[model samples]
Target: STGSATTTPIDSLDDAYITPVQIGTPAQTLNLDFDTGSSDLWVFSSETTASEVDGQTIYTPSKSTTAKLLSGATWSISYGDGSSSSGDVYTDTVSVGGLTVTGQAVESAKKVSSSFTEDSTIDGLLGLAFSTLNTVSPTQQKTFFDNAKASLDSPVFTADLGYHAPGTYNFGFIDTTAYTGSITYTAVSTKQGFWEWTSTGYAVGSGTFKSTSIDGIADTGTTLLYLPATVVSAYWAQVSGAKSSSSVGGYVFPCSATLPSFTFGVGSARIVIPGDYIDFGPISTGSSSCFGGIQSSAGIGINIFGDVALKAAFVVFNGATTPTLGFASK
Candidate 1:
């Protein structure tokens, strides 16, 4: 039988989605962010420094009879956003939704950066990226999906990320009813350990589509869409008061500015992002300025189609031969 799980927004942050996952015996539940950008299932745990841990729940491996320490094994990971975590490893039975993987390497963090400590809600990350990206020292580990793939009816997962709403992440099966229209498939390049693809072109508002191929990764863990600096500049140019703000970093504009829709080409399919969705939100509560949800991938070498872009479409992460990404309007 195929396994599936419902992922819900953690409050109104709309920054990421979290789904309940069980680790070890007696089923200790942790809300994990399904990240497609990297591998390694590391969590805030009993091993994490008390000063660094906030309101987040920590996984206590000692409490689970099934948990076994992977002696001498350790893991450390740094994200593009500068958030990081590192710690010892434990072999435990991990389960997500209804799928279970025995003897999975679960990294237990002894330290975490401010970004993760402040979040306080997410307990950890369940990497959906290629297993090759697992950061465990000495020997790399397989992701939850990788361990469970062989038993799955089909080696496929569907990401139905919603905008400020609950969504579903289906494993082994694609629910046709979750999306509208036919899914457009595009070849993916996994050399970088990401579901990376190239968009044939893009257009601003009603402007003509330019055939400028842009390479990017579809990251569910990221909150915003990141494109090239030139592309970002051109799109913000259409908004009268939009400007690159040194104070806030990235581009910002008056909250009331009328923004145009942005579209990216995937083969013959064009996925459009509404103007309102591009406004992100006010820079701060009651603030007159707002930050652009679409920012430049200046520092980050690769562009990221984060939640902002992924929520605009129903995405299929096909793990079968020659991994490909499929998209359709939700």
Candidate 2:
């Protein structure tokens, strides 16, 4: 009825977190990105064009005895980076951790973007966002969480992300000992199909705590944290040699500069992000200029609390009739 699986990073940069998923009969294990930012469980498959297939593993539906083709069912989705994939649909028994769900929509990719093909580290994505965002044509399908929530002891899931260390995604229950402080509950607005919530306020290091609300989505799929320009600017200014440079990605600074922790208010509870977490990695091969984990969300319409932010706290995605998000310090 419940399950938990470890999510590991592919590189030292912690660019993304991937979890092993057992699919079909006899079980084909694919390391997939568990994304809360999208709502389509798509995978690279035998159906994928040979040209589009890289070194990544593909799921062969023909080999799976339980796979049933949803003829006429098609899907196409595009990411923020302009990378995309289009495919047909099939219903199969998809299992995560030890939790199994039958008749789950398993999108089989027919075409993939160059970006997807180049990245051999991930097979595909397992969407954890609202099912309404599913792009399957004719009739939209439900996400793994939506289909399996009924069988869970509780209608909630938690994300325990780590900084360069292994983490986990928990279904049905929360691990009390996994975090340090009591959780703060906040209402979630799923209008855009994201785990969207608003923080009461935010504080830069030990400086003054700003009372302005910060609206953002908890997206494990994205690597960096994006906030308002003003907040990002203020944080970088605290660092001795930090500057905004698109050539080397968003914000970069000298590796020697000390960084201050960032804190955000969750109702009355405050979640703090250690300064070291902001030092993402080198801008280039071995450059001393390192990228900042936080950046301006100006180009992006919505603020994003990606891995950089979420990894600092234990997050709960409550799926009750009236959904709410919970956060606890770790």
Against the true structure, whose TM-score is highest?
Answer: 2
Q: Please list the residue runs of candidate 2 whose C-alpha ends up more than 4 Å from where it truly belongs after superposition.
A: none
Q: What TM-score goes with each of the models?
A: 0.97, 0.98
lDDT (Cα, tens digit) per residue for candidate 2, span 23-45 = 89979999999999999999999
Against the true structure, candidate 1 reaches a TM-score of: 0.97
Please report the candidate that would top lDDT against the real structure: 2
**Residue pairs in collision within model 1:** none
Each model's lDDT comes to 0.91, 0.92
Residue 328 C-alpha lDDT in model 1? 93
lDDT of 1 by residue, 1-330 (tens): 477788998767578899889999888999999999999899999999999998999999999999999989999999998889999999999987788889999999999999889987799999999999999988888998888888888899889987778999888888999988889999999999999999888999999998999999999999899999999999999999999998898999898888899998889998998887787678899999988988999988899999888888999999997899999987
In model 1, the runs with Cα more than 4 Å from the true position are none
Candidate 2 achieves a global lDDT of: 0.92
- For candidate 1, the lDDT comes to 0.91
